[PDB]
Design an enzyme around this catalytic site. Structure first.
Site, PDB file in Angstrom:
ATOM      1  N   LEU A  44      15.153  12.423 -81.480  1.00 61.82           N
ATOM      2  CA  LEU A  44      15.042  10.836 -81.501  1.00 61.82           C
ATOM      3  C   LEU A  44      13.743  10.460 -82.058  1.00 61.82           C
ATOM      4  CD1 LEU A  44      16.061   9.879 -78.037  1.00 61.82           C
ATOM      5  CD2 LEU A  44      17.369  10.455 -80.212  1.00 61.82           C
ATOM      6  N   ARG A  46       9.310  12.051 -83.449  1.00 62.33           N
ATOM      7  CA  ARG A  46       8.144  13.134 -83.264  1.00 62.33           C
ATOM      8  C   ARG A  46       7.234  12.308 -81.949  1.00 62.33           C
ATOM      9  N   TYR A  49       2.177  14.808 -78.835  1.00 60.20           N
ATOM     10  CA  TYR A  49       2.291  15.920 -77.775  1.00 60.20           C
ATOM     11  C   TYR A  49       3.725  16.503 -77.416  1.00 60.20           C
ATOM     12  CZ  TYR A  49      -2.578  14.167 -76.881  1.00 60.20           C
ATOM     13  OH  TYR A  49      -3.812  13.773 -76.922  1.00 60.20           O
ATOM     14  N   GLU A  51       8.006  16.421 -79.113  1.00 58.44           N
ATOM     15  CA  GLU A  51       9.134  16.265 -79.766  1.00 58.44           C
ATOM     16  C   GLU A  51      10.297  15.781 -79.050  1.00 58.44           C
ATOM     17  OE1 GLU A  51       9.843  19.623 -82.458  1.00 58.44           O
ATOM     18  OE2 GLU A  51       9.087  18.346 -84.258  1.00 58.44           O
ATOM     19  N   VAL A  52      11.152  14.911 -79.461  1.00 58.70           N
ATOM     20  CA  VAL A  52      12.005  14.286 -78.514  1.00 58.70           C
ATOM     21  C   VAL A  52      13.424  14.079 -78.765  1.00 58.70           C
ATOM     22  CG1 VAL A  52      12.538  11.847 -77.523  1.00 58.70           C
ATOM     23  CG2 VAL A  52      10.213  12.280 -77.407  1.00 58.70           C
ATOM     24  N   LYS A  67      12.374  16.087 -73.742  1.00 57.44           N
ATOM     25  CA  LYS A  67      10.841  15.977 -74.307  1.00 57.44           C
ATOM     26  C   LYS A  67      10.273  17.233 -74.216  1.00 57.44           C
ATOM     27  CE  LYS A  67       6.452  13.493 -73.394  1.00 57.44           C
ATOM     28  NZ  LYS A  67       5.854  13.000 -72.217  1.00 57.44           N
ATOM     29  N   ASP A 155      -2.600   4.850 -71.582  1.00 56.49           N
ATOM     30  CA  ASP A 155      -2.131   5.014 -72.949  1.00 56.49           C
ATOM     31  C   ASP A 155      -1.432   3.928 -73.299  1.00 56.49           C
ATOM     32  OD1 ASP A 155      -2.508   6.082 -75.554  1.00 56.49           O
ATOM     33  OD2 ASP A 155      -0.708   7.480 -75.511  1.00 56.49           O
TER      34      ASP A 155
END
Ligand SMILES: Fc1cc(F)c2[nH]ccc2c1
Length: 331
Positions: A44, A46, A49, A51-52, A67, A155
């Protein structure tokens, strides 16, 4: 001497009154699951922390987001997992579903409830001024909850907000920078994304609290009502503070250094200059006006403040008139 200490106006001692295990994420043991339970479907996107992937729990043909973490230190994974488990079930909080290991490396992998993302960019030319208030409200729910749960997200930004526009569902995701608030603790300033860092991060005041999330909420607010992305468009951590000063002006910046006795990096002592505080009207134009309102500008002013203690709290935010319409609608 040195820097004057600070405390959160709200939710201050919330952690001190829970059992140690709650916030002591270092000593938390990970309950792993069976990666064999999931088959990666498709990627889906990047990330810094992780890759999804979209994935299927073959146990029950359930749709799911996997994830794969990028390698940090075990105590950072434990931190992210701990926090997600505390917030689990809370309003607009991404639901952590299982914890497994990438079978061809070992890099742990978090498994989350699936949320369709509506195009973070295609979702702009369709946001009405009510869309923004509503979603702003959904996010504040997530913020009051985790603050009130003793956690700073640290964040906040549109990339880390997942929206399912067709069903008005919204999830605050990617908790990998969150932390527990403890009174008197000093935190890392190198957190959050540059365009969203609080003034306290840039001047290097380490004893911050939940109200840093509130500053970022204001950077989101600005960029969306003015259609300026990012709103504070800094070339680096240093310039980012110059970009803020040009809007808020240097006088309150220097009052805020003065009162906390912060030691300004001498680098600044050449590039901050002197700048008046500019009225929000100057960022209003024909293309963005349908989203600006006195309600909306007042509320933005009350988030974007140098002095972290004087920003609205998440809960104070949710009582602002800019949300009166939303509040009554839910009912
Ligand atoms: F990182 C992960 C996590 C999983 F659950 C997986 N399943 C099959 C591959 C794979 C990788």
């Amino acid at each position: 001497s040195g820097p004057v200490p600070s405390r959160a106006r709200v939710y201050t001692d919330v952690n001190t009154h829970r059992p140690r295990e709650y916030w002591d994420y270092e000593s938390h043991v990970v309950e792993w699951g069976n990666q064999d339970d999931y088959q990666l479907v498709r990627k889906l996107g990047r990330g810094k922390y992780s890759e999804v992937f979209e994935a299927i729990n073959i146990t029950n043909n359930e749709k799911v987001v996997v994830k794969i973490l990028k390698p940090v230190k075990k105590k950072k994974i434990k931190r992210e997992i701990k926090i997600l488990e505390n917030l689990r079930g809370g309003p607009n909080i991404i639901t952590l579903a299982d914890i497994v290991k990438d079978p061809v490396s070992r890099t742990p992998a978090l498994v989350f409830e699936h949320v369709n993302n509506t195009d973070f960019k295609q979702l702009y030319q369709t946001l009405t001024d009510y869309d923004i208030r509503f979603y702003m409200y959904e996010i504040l729910k997530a913020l009051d909850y985790c603050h009130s749960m003793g956690i700073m997200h640290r964040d906040v930004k549109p990339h880390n907000v997942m929206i399912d526009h067709e069903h008005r569902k919204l999830r605050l995701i990617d908790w990998g920078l969150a932390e527990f608030y403890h009174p008197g603790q000093e935190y890392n300033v190198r957190v959050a994304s540059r365009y969203f860092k609080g003034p306290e991060l840039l001047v290097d005041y380490q004893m911050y609290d939940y109200s840093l999330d509130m500053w970022s909420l204001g950077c989101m607010l600005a960029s969306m009502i003015f259609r300026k992305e990012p709103f504070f468009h800094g070339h680096d951590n240093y310039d980012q503070l110059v970009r803020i000063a040009k809007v808020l002006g240097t006088e309150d910046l220097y009052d805020y250094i003065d009162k906390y006795n912060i030691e300004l990096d001498p680098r600044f002592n050449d590039i901050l200059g002197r700048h008046s505080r500019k009225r929000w009207e100057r960022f209003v134009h024909s293309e963005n006006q349908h989203l600006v309102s006195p309600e909306a500008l007042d509320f933005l002013d009350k988030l974007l403040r140098y002095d972290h203690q004087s920003r609205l709290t998440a809960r104070e935010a949710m009582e602002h008139p800019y949300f009166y319409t939303v509040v009554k609608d839910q009912a």
